[PDB]
Every structure is written in C-alpha cells, then in structure tokens.
Amino acid sequence: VDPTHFEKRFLKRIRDLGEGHFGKVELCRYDPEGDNTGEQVAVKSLKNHIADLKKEIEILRNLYHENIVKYKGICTNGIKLIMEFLPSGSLKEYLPKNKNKINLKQQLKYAVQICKGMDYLGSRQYVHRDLAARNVLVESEHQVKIGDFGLTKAIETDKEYYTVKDDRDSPVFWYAPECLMQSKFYIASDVWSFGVTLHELLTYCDSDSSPMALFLKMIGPTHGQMTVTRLVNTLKEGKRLPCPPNCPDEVYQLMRKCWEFQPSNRTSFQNLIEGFEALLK
Numbered sequence: 244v245d246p247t248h249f250e251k252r253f254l255k256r257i258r259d260l261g262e263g264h265f266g267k268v269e270l271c272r273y274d275p276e277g278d279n280t281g282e283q284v285a286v287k288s289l290k291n292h293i294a295d296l297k298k299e300i301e302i303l304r305n306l307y308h309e310n311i312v313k314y315k316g317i318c319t320n321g322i323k324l325i326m327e328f329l330p331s332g333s334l335k336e337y338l339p340k341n342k343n344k345i346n347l348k349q350q351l352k353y354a355v356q357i358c359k360g361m362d363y364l365g366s367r368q369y370v371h372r373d374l375a376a377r378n379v380l381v382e383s384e385h386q387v388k389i390g391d392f393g394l395t396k397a398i399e400t401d402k403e404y405y406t407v408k409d410d411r412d413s414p415v416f417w418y419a420p421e422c423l424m425q426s427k428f429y430i431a432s433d434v435w436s437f438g439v440t441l442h443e444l445l446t447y448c449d450s451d452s453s454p455m456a457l458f459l460k461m462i463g464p465t466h467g468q469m470t471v472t473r474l475v476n477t478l479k480e481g482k483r484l485p486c487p488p489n490c491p492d493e494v495y496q497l498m499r500k501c502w503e504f505q506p507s508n509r510t511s512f513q514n515l516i517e518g519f520e521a522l523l524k
C-alpha cells in the first residue's frame with residue numbers, strides 16, 4: 244500500500260497542459276475504479292534527460308509549503324512525476340481573464356505569497372532559475388503556488404551560487420546580469436527574476452507589455468545572436484523596465500530594489516514581504 248505510487252494502467256490522459264525543457268505536462272485522471280470518478284492530476288513525463296526529471300522529483304517530494312505546488316507521487320527505467328492539478332492554470336492564463344476581480348490589493352497578496360514560497364526554497368538552499376508569471380499557478384482568487392521546478396538547482400553549503408552549463412534555452416529577459424554574463428546563479432538572481440514576475444503581475448500578463456516585448460523595444464528585435472550582449476549592455480547603462488500603468492511609485496521602488504546590478508545590493512525576499520505587508524495594512 245503506497246499512496247505515492249500510481250499504476251500506469253489507471254492513469255488516463257485527458258489533455259496537454261504544457262511543454263518545456265525536454266518534458267511535457269498533461270492533465271490525467273487517476274481512475275482505479277474505471278468510472279471517471281477518480282482524481283485529476285498533472286503528470287510530467289519526458290518527450291537523454293531522465294536524470295534531470297529524477298532530480299526534479301527528489302526536490303519537489305521534499306518541499307512542503309502552501310505556496311509550492313504539491314507532489315502526489317510517481318508512476319514508474321522510465322518515470323512520471325504526479326502533482327496536484329490547479330484548473331485555473333498560471334498567472335499568464337488567469338490574469339488576462341480576471342482583471343475586474345484582481346485589484347491592486349490582491350496583486351500585492353499574490354506578490355507576498357510568491358515571496359514566501361521563494362524564501363522557503365532559498366532556506367532549503369535552492370535556486371529556482373525559472374521564476375516568471377507563466378510558472379506561478381493559481382489555486383484560487385486568494386492563493387497562488389510556484390510550479391515548474393524543472394531548472395531548480397541546489398547551491399552547495401558554504402557557497403553563494405550555482406554555475407550553469409546547459410544555458411541554450413535560458414529565459415534571458417528574466418535573468419540577472421551575473422546569469423547572462425558568467426552563468427552564475429545566486430539566491431539574489433531569483434530576487435531579480437521576482438522583480439520581473441512582479442512587473443508581469445502588475446500588467447496582468449499582457450503580451451504587449453511583457454518583459455521580452457518591452458526589452459526588445461529598448462535594444463532592437465532584429466539582432467539575433469547579438470540580443471543577449473545588447474541586453475547586458477543596456478542593463479550595465481542602468482536601464483530597467485518602466486513603471487507599469489496604474490502602479491503606485493512605492494510598489495515600483497520595491498521592484499527596482501530587485502534590479503540592483505550587483506547581487507549583494509539587491510533586496511531579500513524577507514524585506515519584500517515586509518515592504519508589501521506595510522502597503523497592505
């Protein structure tokens with residue numbers, strides 16, 4: 244009797260949820276009774292990268308936080324990661340359709356929840372490396388959870404960063420300068436990405452206001468292989484994403500502390516929580 248062991252014969256595919264770094268996530272129904280009363284689960288499998296999937300399963304299995312998507316089990320030399328299903332999807336799907344319901348106060352409550360989940364990850368000595376609104380799952384109108392731990396790496400004890408080797412598919416427009424220049428990942432690099440995720444959240448993930456769309460306006464969209472170097476050059480000059488429309492300056496200042504060039508000059512997740520909470524009450 245293993246509640247974390249899912250039999251393949253009972254896992255019925257419903258549809259695709261997402262595709263990414265050599266993996267795919269699908270909506271399935273675990274139906275051991277065969278009457279469609281079974282629980283719906285998000286199933287991550289591979290499209291050799293079994294080693295990365297296995298490390299991701301080991302990371303998520305030992306993470307327990309209300310703002311972190313829940314591990315449910317595995318389906319087994321192939322393996323599948325079984326997670327809880329959040330029907331609202333991510334901030335990217337949810338925010339454009341719920342602008343009327345999600346006011347400034349609620350956006351700040353989501354930012355606090357994202358910081359809490361991230362601070363918990365950082366206390367376990369992990370760097371997420373893919374913090375974006377597309378990876379923030381919606382449990383309800385009052386709660387969000389960090390999903391997709393596909394790029395998550397451990398920082399060694401008595402070390403401040405993780406050195407990245409495979410960087411071909413890096414979300415460069417969400418990355419801190421030390422990540423773009425030296426392929427070094429600090430907890431402070433996740434703080435930088437949080438500032439960008441906060442920007443998306445305040446713009447309700449509008450495609451025309453996206454960090455990529457906005458940065459490509461600043462540096463040019465026709466530079467190809469020279470994009471990253473032009474982006475690094477722009478950041479070095481002190482240029483950042485502009486204040487979102489209807490965003491109060493006090494929220495903008497918190498965001499800009501995420502974007503200090505030097506990692507050691509950046510705000511912490513705990514300072515962000517304090518800052519947002521002072522604005523809330």
Ligand SMILES: COc1cc(F)c(-c2nc3c(NCC4CCNCC4)c(Cl)cnc3[nH]2)cc1OC
Pocket residue numbers: 260261268285312326327328329330331332333336377378379380390391
């Ligand atoms: C309306 O469009 C969607 C609705 C949805 F409900 C979902 C969804 N995705 C997951 C999911 N993982 C998937 C990844 C996706 C991209 N970011 C990181 C999560 C997990 Cl673990 C648990 N429930 C989930 N629900 C996705 C959707 O389109 C992206």
